[PDB]
């Protein structure tokens, strides 16, 4: 937010494909208002959602380190499993090798 804080050295990217455009839209609203605040409260630095097509996108979460990422994921795995029931989810994650700006 207002502080630079930890350098985000670990990133998790969730690709999310919903069953329709309107279901996708509702999911994004849910990820903005409930999910992203929750993971930030648990240690995430930031979360962004990028739209790929009408019913799918990428949810990108930045973490200070792998350990924080693991911590959060462990805490929310039951909610993730529920998300997988309605959606096609693929999670890809790892360490930041470089950032240029």
Using the contact rule CB under 5 A, the part of the chain among 2-10, 21-29, 48-56, 85-93 near Cl ion is: 85-93
Verify binding: residue 90, Cl ion, rule CB under 5 A.
Answer: yes
Number of residues that bind a copy of itself (CB under 8 A): 32
Contacts from 74-78 at CB under 8 Å and sequence distance 24+? 75/42, 76/38, 76/39, 76/42
Q: Are 21 and 55 in contact (CB under 8 A)?
A: yes
Which of residues 21 and 88 has its CB atom nearest to Cl ion in the complex? 88
**What gap in Å lies between CA 39 and CA 58, rounded to an integer?**
16
> In the complex, which residues of this chain contact Cl ion (CB under 5 A)?
12, 39, 61, 88, 90-91
> In the complex, which residues of this chain contact a copy of itself (CB under 8 A)?
1, 11, 13, 15, 28, 31-32, 36-37, 40, 45-53, 57-58, 60, 92-101
């Amino acid at each position: 937010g207002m502080f630079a804080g930890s350098i985000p050295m670990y990133i998790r990217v969730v690709s999310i494909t919903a069953q329709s455009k309107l279901q996708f839209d509702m999911t994004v609203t849910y990820f903005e208002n409930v999910w992203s605040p929750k993971v930030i409260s648990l240690g995430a630095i930031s979360a962004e959602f990028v739209q790929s097509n009408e019913n799918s996108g990428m949810y990108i979460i930045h973490y200070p380190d792998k350990q924080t990422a693991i911590s959060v994921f462990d805490k929310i795995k039951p909610e993730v499993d529920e998300v997988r029931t309605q959606n096609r989810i693929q999670i890809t994650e790892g360490k930041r090798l470089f950032r240029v700006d």
